Amino acid sequence: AIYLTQSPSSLSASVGERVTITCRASQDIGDTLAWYQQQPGRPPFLVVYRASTLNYGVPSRFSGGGSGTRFTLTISSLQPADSGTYFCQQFKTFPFTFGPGTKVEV
Amino acid sequence: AMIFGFLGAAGSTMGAASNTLTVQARQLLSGIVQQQSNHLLQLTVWGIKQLQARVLAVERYLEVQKFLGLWGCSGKIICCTAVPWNSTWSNKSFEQIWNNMTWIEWEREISNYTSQIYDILTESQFQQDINEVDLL
Amino acid sequence: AMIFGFLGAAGSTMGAASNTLTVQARQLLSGIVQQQSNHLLQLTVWGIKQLQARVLAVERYLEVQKFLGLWGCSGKIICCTAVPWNSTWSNKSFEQIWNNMTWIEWEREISNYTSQIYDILTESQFQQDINEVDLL
Amino acid sequence: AMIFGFLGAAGSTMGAASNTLTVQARQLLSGIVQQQSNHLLQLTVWGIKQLQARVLAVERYLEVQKFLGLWGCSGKIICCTAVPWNSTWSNKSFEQIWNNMTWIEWEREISNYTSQIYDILTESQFQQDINEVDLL
Amino acid sequence: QSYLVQSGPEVKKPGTAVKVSCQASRYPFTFFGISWVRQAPGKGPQWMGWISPYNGHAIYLDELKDRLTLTTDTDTTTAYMELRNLRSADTAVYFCARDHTRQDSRGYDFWGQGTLVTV
Ligand SMILES: *[C@@H]1O[C@H](CO)[C@@H](O[C@@H]2O[C@H](CO)[C@@H](O[C@@H]3O[C@H](CO[C@H]4O[C@H](CO[C@H]5O[C@H](CO)[C@@H](O)[C@H](O)[C@@H]5O)[C@@H](O)[C@H](O[C@H]5O[C@H](CO)[C@@H](O)[C@H](O)[C@@H]5O)[C@@H]4O)[C@@H](O)[C@H](O[C@H]4O[C@H](CO)[C@@H](O)[C@H](O)[C@@H]4O)[C@@H]3O)[C@H](O)[C@H]2NC(C)=O)[C@H](O)[C@H]1NC(C)=O
Ligand SMILES: *[C@@H]1O[C@H](CO)[C@@H](O[C@@H]2O[C@H](CO)[C@@H](O[C@@H]3O[C@H](CO[C@H]4O[C@H](CO[C@H]5O[C@H](CO)[C@@H](O)[C@H](O)[C@@H]5O)[C@@H](O)[C@H](O[C@H]5O[C@H](CO)[C@@H](O)[C@H](O)[C@@H]5O)[C@@H]4O)[C@@H](O)[C@H](O[C@H]4O[C@H](CO)[C@@H](O)[C@H](O)[C@@H]4O)[C@@H]3O)[C@H](O)[C@H]2NC(C)=O)[C@H](O)[C@H]1NC(C)=O
Ligand SMILES: *[C@@H]1O[C@H](CO)[C@@H](O[C@@H]2O[C@H](CO)[C@@H](O[C@@H]3O[C@H](CO[C@H]4O[C@H](CO[C@H]5O[C@H](CO)[C@@H](O)[C@H](O)[C@@H]5O)[C@@H](O)[C@H](O[C@H]5O[C@H](CO)[C@@H](O)[C@H](O)[C@@H]5O)[C@@H]4O)[C@@H](O)[C@H](O[C@H]4O[C@H](CO)[C@@H](O)[C@H](O)[C@@H]4O)[C@@H]3O)[C@H](O)[C@H]2NC(C)=O)[C@H](O)[C@H]1NC(C)=O
Ligand SMILES: *[C@@H]1O[C@H](CO[C@@H]2O[C@@H](C)[C@@H](O)[C@@H](O)[C@@H]2O)[C@@H](O[C@@H]2O[C@H](CO)[C@@H](O[C@@H]3O[C@H](CO[C@H]4O[C@H](CO[C@H]5O[C@H](CO)[C@@H](O)[C@H](O)[C@@H]5O)[C@@H](O)[C@H](O)[C@@H]4O)[C@@H](O)[C@H](O[C@H]4O[C@H](CO)[C@@H](O)[C@H](O)[C@@H]4O)[C@@H]3O)[C@H](O)[C@H]2NC(C)=O)[C@H](O)[C@H]1NC(C)=O
Ligand SMILES: *[C@@H]1O[C@H](CO)[C@@H](O[C@@H]2O[C@H](CO)[C@@H](O)[C@H](O)[C@H]2NC(C)=O)[C@H](O)[C@H]1NC(C)=O
Ligand SMILES: *[C@@H]1O[C@H](CO)[C@@H](O[C@@H]2O[C@H](CO)[C@@H](O)[C@H](O)[C@H]2NC(C)=O)[C@H](O)[C@H]1NC(C)=O
Ligand SMILES: *[C@@H]1O[C@H](CO)[C@@H](O)[C@H](O)[C@H]1NC(C)=O
Ligand SMILES: *[C@@H]1O[C@H](CO)[C@@H](O)[C@H](O)[C@H]1NC(C)=O
Ligand SMILES: *[C@@H]1O[C@H](CO)[C@@H](O)[C@H](O)[C@H]1NC(C)=O
Ligand SMILES: *[C@@H]1O[C@H](CO)[C@@H](O)[C@H](O)[C@H]1NC(C)=O
Ligand SMILES: *[C@@H]1O[C@H](CO)[C@@H](O)[C@H](O)[C@H]1NC(C)=O
Ligand SMILES: *[C@@H]1O[C@H](CO)[C@@H](O)[C@H](O)[C@H]1NC(C)=O
Ligand SMILES: *[C@@H]1O[C@H](CO)[C@@H](O)[C@H](O)[C@H]1NC(C)=O
């Protein structure tokens, strides 16, 4: 029963800056974390899995890292397509809980 | 977890199929062909067909054993080498191979570079022996 | 101490017979069957018998070499293993085996567990390779 | 420096010929004789000459492999031993062998002592296993 | 290859039972596991259960342990989900997600369009 807490709630953003999303954990999670990009009216889309690997078809500007309890999702060259909210999920405990979610303003 | 028979884990991923290597390896030379076979009895129609099978069973075993010797892997089920993986034969990550592929699917994927990989492995083992003679 | 011939130490205890292992091992594949053999000359009555004798000699040699590879003992006369002895196959002490028994008597005593022991030896070697891949 | 073909370095000295050992070793068991062979088709005139060519190609491979196992050199291209060189087989120095002689010339020089050397090599490996069993 | 399609929306009165089916096609159904998540309106996804279409083994969430059961069908390659004792707060979009890989997926590859149910 691990709870995922991620901050900040919102990110004021425009084109071309280092936007970072941090997802904390209440217990040792390891490298078993995933990031989902949800656009309006669309189901969540996996972008990063294992906290380091990039899903098929995602632009290389995305990146993730960290281990243990601290994780990040950084976009180097934010572009007008990276809208919507993001979620982090844990994949080691009996329930695979999600995170509250953060929205990027563009 | 249960033990499998011969080729029973052909449909499972590599991570699970690699735990049943001795099942296939134990049956490569031994068979019922080497029995006593119950008009020369060794020139009959099936006297010849048995003899050819015996020679075929020996060539198949020695064909694999020849490569194990050149690569320094004699007497090992899983042998580690000093040849770095080249990300042109395949650039799949750990989970995309050992958790998503079967040994049949993979060996078809790198089938174009098996000949190249074999030559490199032989050349690598040769360097280790060269580097050891002029080191001791 | 004197050198023995082929099977000259069959009647001596293990402690003295094990000092002549290379005498028996040196004669397993090489013999006069591979000569030049002084109406198809290779189809005569004694042209066929020589042929299958040549194939018989190879299979007998490869039948032992198959196990040495599985157990990890390739290239060894006496090979130590990591399999603990089980006091159900035999519970004789050191002096009751190496100073009181011949290799023929002993192999008959544990004849019921040779097949079981062979499987364990292969499984043991497999674990070492598994424990090495995920350790380096 | 260029790669050679099969036996392309037969005329070069040892120091340069030993850099092409994998070329000769790679062709000892594999050939076109193991093909499908395009009135029993395997009793014809060339149905037999092919069968005896397949058995011949196997004994030639196993004959060398038998000695590698006894000497503890299985799976190695160049294998080092613990047998000191005896200055009766040949007393030439380093420069008089590896910079002035070819492998064919040398193997004829020590041709009288190869059998003696083979037995010594086998006996030496036996002592290593004996000294290890009663040491651990 | 592979695509998961769910049923249409349902407007079920409180206290009733709702069954939603996610149909999988054009890929080996039994190889990859199926997960269900519900995105409460104006909220983030919540994980409910994971069902293996190979051996039927299922995993549930404690709050839904006694209320939710997942069943799988092989011949027509369809995944079913039934929920009983529908509280007023159960209104949410329901998704069926395919596992990333055949073993230790740690990710979801393909989703469904969603099935918003009102209670
Ligand atoms: C033919 O093909 C099919 C499909 O391709 C294939 O089926 C796969 O078989 C493999 C077997 O090798 C399965 O992998 C195993 O799965 C076991 C079950 O895992 C699930 O359940 C876990 C919790 O179960 C515990 O608790 C319940 C009670 O709730 C209890 O009954 C159980 O017995 C058990 O105690 C759960 O944790 C697990 O979650 C994993 O997977 C999800 C998604 O895959 C992932 O997101 C998680 O992060 C986590 O990794 C899953 O929900 C599992 O117990 C077992 O684990 C053992 O082995 C691994 C090997 O590494 C060890 O690390 C581990 O410590 C255990 O010892 C193993 O993971 C796989 O799930 C099947 N796939 C499907 C879709 O069903 C067949 O095998 C193929 N057959 C042939 C012959 O080819
Ligand atoms: C066919 O079967 C027969 C019978 O089964 C078998 O005969 C046995 O052959 C083995 C050879 O491997 C014999 O074992 C050897 O015995 C040697 C002689 O031991 C006796 O004499 C010792 C003293 O002798 C010294 O002094 C005398 C002068 O007094 C001198 O002439 C000698 O040359 C020598 O210098 C004595 O110490 C010894 O006592 C031992 O044995 C008794 C009883 O067994 C025991 O109670 C003692 O505690 C002690 O252990 C015995 O009285 C012996 O020299 C020789 O030792 C060498 O080898 C061992 C190997 O481990 C080394 O440890 C040791 O340091 C020496 O290098 C060895 O022990 C055995 O005795 C025969 N059995 C019988 C009944 O005669 C044949 O070999 C078989 N043949 C075939 C082909 O199968
Ligand atoms: C058939 O038989 C023939 C004859 O038996 C045989 O020919 C021999 O082939 C071997 C090849 O393995 C030759 O050995 C090589 O020789 C190279 C040339 O050496 C000479 O030139 C050196 C300087 O050259 C440099 O500078 C010039 C410009 O000035 C430039 O063009 C060159 O490319 C190079 O950059 C010179 O130093 C050298 O002196 C050596 O030899 C003399 C006399 O033997 C000795 O007294 C010296 O002390 C010194 O050792 C010579 O004058 C040479 O570059 C090459 O070196 C490489 O390999 C060695 C291997 O150990 C490395 O240590 C070294 O670092 C280099 O990497 C190598 O030594 C040999 O000279 C031939 N013999 C004759 C008589 O021509 C064929 O190979 C046979 N063919 C077959 C198929 O069997
Ligand atoms: C683990 O393995 C599974 C299974 O692997 C598959 O099965 C095994 C048995 C082997 O045969 C493998 O070789 C084989 O791949 C993996 O699942 C696959 O994942 C990929 C990537 O996600 C996925 O391909 C994407 O499909 C998306 C949705 O499908 C639409 O497009 C298809 C296209 O099909 C046409 O093209 C193929 C090949 O050219 C033809 O064979 C076929 O006949 C069609 O003509 C269409 O059929 C559907 O109806 C959908 O319309 C699709 O959006 C993607 O397109 C994008 O691809 C890249 C990104 O990868 C972008 O850059 C492009 O611009 C496109 O926008 C992909 O085509 C496969 O369908 C999955 N297969 C199955 C069976 O599920 C899984 O990914 C592996 N996990 C890992 C590696 O972690
Ligand atoms: C392995 O090599 C084969 C042979 O070169 C490749 O197959 C070719 O693929 C191209 C791609 O369109 C075709 O135009 C050729 O006609 C194919 N050749 C044959 C003989 O079919 C193959 O793509 C390579 N890769 C793999 C993974 O097999
Ligand atoms: C190797 O052994 C052969 C055979 O013993 C030696 O050849 C003999 O050499 C002497 C020396 O003059 C001759 O008298 C004998 O007639 C030779 N014997 C034969 C059968 O030809 C040879 O000298 C030894 N050494 C080498 C390097 O070969
Ligand atoms: C990988 O293999 C290709 C040919 O398949 C070769 O050209 C390339 O040099 C290799 N990579 C490295 C680092 O050598
Ligand atoms: C892996 O190689 C394939 C070539 O088939 C290429 O399409 C893909 O982009 C490569 N992926 C990475 C991460 O390099
Ligand atoms: C010894 O062998 C018997 C069967 O031969 C087996 O039942 C027993 O478990 C073995 N001993 C141990 C310690 O495993
Ligand atoms: C050894 O095993 C035998 C069974 O053949 C038994 O009779 C004997 O008592 C055992 N001895 C010891 C010391 O365990
Ligand atoms: C071996 O097995 C046979 C048959 O089960 C049995 O009669 C015999 O007592 C066992 N032991 C030995 C030493 O043969
Ligand atoms: C060298 O070999 C000869 C026989 O060719 C032998 O007489 C001599 O003892 C050997 N040298 C040594 C040091 O053993
Ligand atoms: C080497 O042996 C030969 C025997 O053919 C002998 O003539 C020569 O003097 C020996 N050289 C040395 C340095 O011992």
Short mmCIF file of N, CA, C and O in Angstrom, two decimals, chain C residues 18-22 25-30 33-34 40 42-43 47 51 53-55 57-58 61-62 65 74-80 94, chain D residues 43-45 48 51-52 55-56 58-60 62-63 65-74 119 122-123 125-126 129-130 132-134 136:
data_model
loop_
_atom_site.label_atom_id
_atom_site.label_comp_id
_atom_site.label_asym_id
_atom_site.label_seq_id
_atom_site.Cartn_x
_atom_site.Cartn_y
_atom_site.Cartn_z
N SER C 18 43.65 -45.74 -8.54
CA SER C 18 43.48 -44.38 -9.04
C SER C 18 44.79 -43.74 -9.47
O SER C 18 44.76 -42.65 -10.05
N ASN C 19 45.92 -44.37 -9.20
CA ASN C 19 47.21 -43.88 -9.67
C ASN C 19 47.53 -44.35 -11.08
O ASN C 19 48.62 -44.07 -11.58
N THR C 20 46.61 -45.05 -11.74
CA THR C 20 46.81 -45.55 -13.10
C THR C 20 45.66 -45.16 -14.01
O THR C 20 45.33 -45.89 -14.95
N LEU C 21 45.02 -44.02 -13.75
CA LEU C 21 43.86 -43.63 -14.54
C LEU C 21 44.24 -43.34 -15.98
O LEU C 21 43.49 -43.68 -16.90
N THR C 22 45.39 -42.71 -16.21
CA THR C 22 45.78 -42.36 -17.57
C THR C 22 46.06 -43.58 -18.44
O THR C 22 46.10 -43.44 -19.66
N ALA C 25 42.50 -44.31 -19.75
CA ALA C 25 41.95 -43.18 -20.49
C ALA C 25 42.66 -42.99 -21.83
O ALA C 25 42.05 -42.50 -22.78
N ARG C 26 43.93 -43.38 -21.91
CA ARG C 26 44.69 -43.16 -23.14
C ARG C 26 44.27 -44.10 -24.26
O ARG C 26 44.67 -43.89 -25.40
N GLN C 27 43.47 -45.12 -23.96
CA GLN C 27 42.98 -46.06 -24.97
C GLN C 27 41.46 -46.04 -24.95
O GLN C 27 40.83 -46.90 -24.34
N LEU C 28 40.88 -45.07 -25.65
CA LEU C 28 39.43 -44.97 -25.81
C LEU C 28 38.98 -44.68 -27.23
O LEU C 28 37.82 -44.97 -27.55
N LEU C 29 39.82 -44.12 -28.08
CA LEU C 29 39.42 -43.79 -29.44
C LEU C 29 40.43 -44.31 -30.44
O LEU C 29 40.10 -44.58 -31.60
N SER C 30 41.68 -44.47 -30.01
CA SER C 30 42.78 -44.81 -30.89
C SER C 30 43.02 -46.31 -30.87
O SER C 30 43.15 -46.91 -29.79
N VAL C 33 41.96 -50.16 -35.65
CA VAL C 33 40.80 -50.20 -36.54
C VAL C 33 40.90 -49.13 -37.62
O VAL C 33 40.29 -49.25 -38.68
N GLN C 34 41.67 -48.07 -37.37
CA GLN C 34 41.80 -46.96 -38.30
C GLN C 34 42.95 -47.16 -39.29
O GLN C 34 43.43 -46.17 -39.86
N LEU C 40 33.86 -54.63 -54.44
CA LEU C 40 34.23 -53.35 -53.87
C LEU C 40 34.84 -53.60 -52.49
O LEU C 40 34.15 -54.08 -51.59
N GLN C 42 35.46 -52.03 -49.94
CA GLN C 42 34.77 -51.47 -48.79
C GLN C 42 33.38 -52.04 -48.59
O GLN C 42 32.70 -51.65 -47.63
N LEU C 43 32.92 -52.94 -49.46
CA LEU C 43 31.64 -53.61 -49.30
C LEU C 43 31.78 -55.09 -48.98
O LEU C 43 30.77 -55.78 -48.81
N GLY C 47 34.87 -55.62 -44.89
CA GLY C 47 34.97 -54.19 -45.11
C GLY C 47 33.87 -53.47 -44.36
O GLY C 47 34.04 -52.34 -43.92
N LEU C 51 34.07 -50.94 -40.92
CA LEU C 51 33.41 -49.64 -40.94
C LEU C 51 32.60 -49.42 -39.67
O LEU C 51 32.77 -48.40 -38.99
N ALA C 53 32.86 -50.93 -36.90
CA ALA C 53 33.76 -50.88 -35.76
C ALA C 53 34.32 -49.48 -35.56
O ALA C 53 34.49 -49.03 -34.42
N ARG C 54 34.62 -48.78 -36.65
CA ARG C 54 35.10 -47.41 -36.55
C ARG C 54 34.04 -46.49 -35.95
O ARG C 54 34.35 -45.59 -35.17
N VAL C 55 32.77 -46.70 -36.33
CA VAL C 55 31.70 -45.89 -35.78
C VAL C 55 31.41 -46.28 -34.34
O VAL C 55 31.02 -45.44 -33.52
N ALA C 57 33.66 -47.26 -32.13
CA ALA C 57 34.69 -46.67 -31.29
C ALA C 57 34.41 -45.20 -31.00
O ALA C 57 34.69 -44.72 -29.90
N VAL C 58 33.87 -44.47 -31.98
CA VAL C 58 33.60 -43.05 -31.79
C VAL C 58 32.47 -42.85 -30.79
O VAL C 58 32.58 -42.03 -29.88
N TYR C 61 33.46 -43.27 -27.23
CA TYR C 61 34.25 -42.16 -26.72
C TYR C 61 33.38 -40.94 -26.46
O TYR C 61 33.54 -40.26 -25.44
N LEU C 62 32.44 -40.64 -27.37
CA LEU C 62 31.58 -39.48 -27.20
C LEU C 62 30.53 -39.70 -26.12
O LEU C 62 29.98 -38.72 -25.61
N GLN C 65 32.40 -38.40 -23.12
CA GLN C 65 32.67 -36.98 -23.26
C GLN C 65 31.41 -36.14 -23.18
O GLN C 65 31.50 -34.95 -22.86
N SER C 74 35.34 -30.96 -18.39
CA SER C 74 36.09 -31.13 -19.63
C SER C 74 37.57 -30.89 -19.39
O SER C 74 37.96 -29.91 -18.75
N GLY C 75 38.40 -31.79 -19.91
CA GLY C 75 39.84 -31.63 -19.80
C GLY C 75 40.41 -31.97 -18.45
O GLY C 75 41.49 -31.48 -18.11
N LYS C 76 39.72 -32.79 -17.66
CA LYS C 76 40.17 -33.16 -16.33
C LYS C 76 40.19 -34.68 -16.22
O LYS C 76 39.30 -35.35 -16.73
N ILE C 77 41.21 -35.21 -15.55
CA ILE C 77 41.22 -36.63 -15.21
C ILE C 77 40.39 -36.88 -13.96
O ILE C 77 39.46 -37.69 -13.97
N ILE C 78 40.71 -36.18 -12.88
CA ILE C 78 39.92 -36.20 -11.66
C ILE C 78 39.31 -34.82 -11.48
O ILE C 78 40.04 -33.83 -11.38
N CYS C 79 37.99 -34.76 -11.44
CA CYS C 79 37.26 -33.50 -11.40
C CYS C 79 36.45 -33.43 -10.12
O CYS C 79 35.62 -34.32 -9.86
N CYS C 80 36.68 -32.39 -9.33
CA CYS C 80 35.94 -32.17 -8.10
C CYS C 80 34.64 -31.44 -8.40
O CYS C 80 34.61 -30.54 -9.25
N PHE C 94 35.95 -43.59 4.87
CA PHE C 94 37.09 -43.48 3.96
C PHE C 94 37.83 -44.81 3.84
O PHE C 94 38.14 -45.25 2.73
N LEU D 43 24.06 -46.63 -51.65
CA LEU D 43 24.88 -47.80 -51.94
C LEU D 43 25.59 -47.69 -53.28
O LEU D 43 26.31 -48.61 -53.66
N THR D 44 25.40 -46.58 -54.00
CA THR D 44 26.06 -46.40 -55.28
C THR D 44 27.56 -46.25 -55.07
O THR D 44 28.07 -46.31 -53.95
N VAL D 45 28.29 -46.07 -56.17
CA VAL D 45 29.74 -45.98 -56.08
C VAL D 45 30.15 -44.80 -55.21
O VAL D 45 31.04 -44.92 -54.36
N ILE D 48 28.95 -44.51 -51.18
CA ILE D 48 29.82 -45.06 -50.15
C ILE D 48 31.03 -44.16 -49.93
O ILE D 48 31.43 -43.92 -48.79
N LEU D 51 30.06 -41.56 -47.59
CA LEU D 51 29.86 -42.02 -46.22
C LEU D 51 31.19 -42.20 -45.50
O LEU D 51 31.33 -41.82 -44.34
N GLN D 52 32.17 -42.80 -46.17
CA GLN D 52 33.47 -42.99 -45.55
C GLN D 52 34.27 -41.70 -45.49
O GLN D 52 35.25 -41.62 -44.74
N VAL D 55 32.87 -40.19 -42.02
CA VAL D 55 33.48 -40.81 -40.86
C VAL D 55 34.95 -40.42 -40.75
O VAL D 55 35.47 -40.22 -39.65
N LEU D 56 35.64 -40.31 -41.89
CA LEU D 56 37.04 -39.89 -41.87
C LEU D 56 37.18 -38.49 -41.30
O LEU D 56 38.07 -38.22 -40.49
N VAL D 58 35.48 -37.09 -39.16
CA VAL D 58 35.16 -37.04 -37.74
C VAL D 58 36.31 -37.58 -36.91
O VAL D 58 36.68 -37.00 -35.88
N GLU D 59 36.89 -38.70 -37.33
CA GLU D 59 38.03 -39.26 -36.61
C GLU D 59 39.21 -38.31 -36.63
O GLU D 59 39.95 -38.22 -35.64
N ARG D 60 39.43 -37.60 -37.73
CA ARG D 60 40.50 -36.61 -37.78
C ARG D 60 40.28 -35.50 -36.78
O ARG D 60 41.25 -34.97 -36.22
N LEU D 62 38.39 -35.84 -33.89
CA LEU D 62 38.44 -36.40 -32.54
C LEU D 62 39.85 -36.81 -32.15
O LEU D 62 40.18 -36.83 -30.96
N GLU D 63 40.70 -37.14 -33.12
CA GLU D 63 42.06 -37.53 -32.80
C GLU D 63 42.82 -36.40 -32.13
O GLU D 63 43.54 -36.61 -31.16
N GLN D 65 41.28 -33.75 -30.69
CA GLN D 65 40.55 -33.37 -29.49
C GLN D 65 40.80 -34.32 -28.34
O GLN D 65 40.68 -33.93 -27.17
N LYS D 66 41.14 -35.58 -28.62
CA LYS D 66 41.44 -36.51 -27.54
C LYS D 66 42.64 -36.04 -26.74
O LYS D 66 42.63 -36.10 -25.50
N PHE D 67 43.68 -35.56 -27.42
CA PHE D 67 44.88 -35.12 -26.73
C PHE D 67 44.66 -33.82 -25.97
O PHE D 67 45.21 -33.64 -24.88
N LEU D 68 43.87 -32.90 -26.53
CA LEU D 68 43.61 -31.65 -25.83
C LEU D 68 42.96 -31.92 -24.48
O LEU D 68 43.27 -31.25 -23.49
N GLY D 69 42.04 -32.88 -24.42
CA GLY D 69 41.38 -33.18 -23.16
C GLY D 69 42.32 -33.76 -22.13
O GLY D 69 42.28 -33.38 -20.96
N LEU D 70 43.18 -34.69 -22.54
CA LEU D 70 44.09 -35.32 -21.59
C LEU D 70 45.05 -34.30 -20.99
O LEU D 70 45.38 -34.39 -19.80
N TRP D 71 45.51 -33.34 -21.78
CA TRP D 71 46.48 -32.36 -21.33
C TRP D 71 45.84 -31.17 -20.63
O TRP D 71 46.57 -30.28 -20.17
N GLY D 72 44.52 -31.14 -20.52
CA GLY D 72 43.86 -30.03 -19.85
C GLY D 72 43.78 -28.76 -20.66
O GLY D 72 43.64 -27.68 -20.08
N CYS D 73 43.87 -28.86 -21.98
CA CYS D 73 43.88 -27.70 -22.87
C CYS D 73 42.59 -27.56 -23.66
O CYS D 73 42.57 -26.88 -24.69
N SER D 74 41.51 -28.18 -23.20
CA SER D 74 40.25 -28.11 -23.92
C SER D 74 39.75 -26.68 -23.99
O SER D 74 39.78 -25.94 -23.00
N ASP D 119 53.30 -38.25 -23.85
CA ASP D 119 53.10 -38.99 -22.61
C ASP D 119 53.42 -38.12 -21.40
O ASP D 119 52.72 -38.18 -20.38
N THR D 122 50.50 -35.71 -20.77
CA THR D 122 49.37 -36.39 -20.13
C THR D 122 49.65 -36.66 -18.66
O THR D 122 48.78 -36.45 -17.81
N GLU D 123 50.85 -37.14 -18.35
CA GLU D 123 51.18 -37.45 -16.96
C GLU D 123 51.19 -36.19 -16.11
O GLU D 123 50.79 -36.23 -14.94
N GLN D 125 49.35 -33.44 -16.42
CA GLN D 125 47.98 -33.06 -16.08
C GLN D 125 47.40 -33.98 -15.02
O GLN D 125 46.59 -33.55 -14.20
N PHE D 126 47.79 -35.25 -15.03
CA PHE D 126 47.31 -36.19 -14.02
C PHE D 126 47.78 -35.79 -12.63
O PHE D 126 47.02 -35.88 -11.66
N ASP D 129 45.67 -32.96 -11.03
CA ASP D 129 44.41 -33.40 -10.45
C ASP D 129 44.63 -34.20 -9.18
O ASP D 129 43.87 -34.07 -8.21
N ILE D 130 45.68 -35.03 -9.14
CA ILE D 130 46.01 -35.76 -7.92
C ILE D 130 46.36 -34.78 -6.80
O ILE D 130 45.89 -34.92 -5.67
N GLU D 132 45.39 -31.85 -6.40
CA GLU D 132 44.26 -31.00 -6.03
C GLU D 132 43.24 -31.74 -5.18
O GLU D 132 42.65 -31.14 -4.27
N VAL D 133 43.03 -33.03 -5.45
CA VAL D 133 42.06 -33.79 -4.67
C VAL D 133 42.48 -33.86 -3.21
O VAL D 133 41.66 -33.68 -2.30
N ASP D 134 43.76 -34.12 -2.95
CA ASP D 134 44.28 -34.22 -1.60
C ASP D 134 44.83 -32.89 -1.09
O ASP D 134 45.75 -32.88 -0.25
N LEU D 136 42.28 -29.89 -1.16
CA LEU D 136 41.09 -29.13 -0.79
C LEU D 136 40.31 -29.84 0.31
O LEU D 136 40.90 -30.45 1.20
#
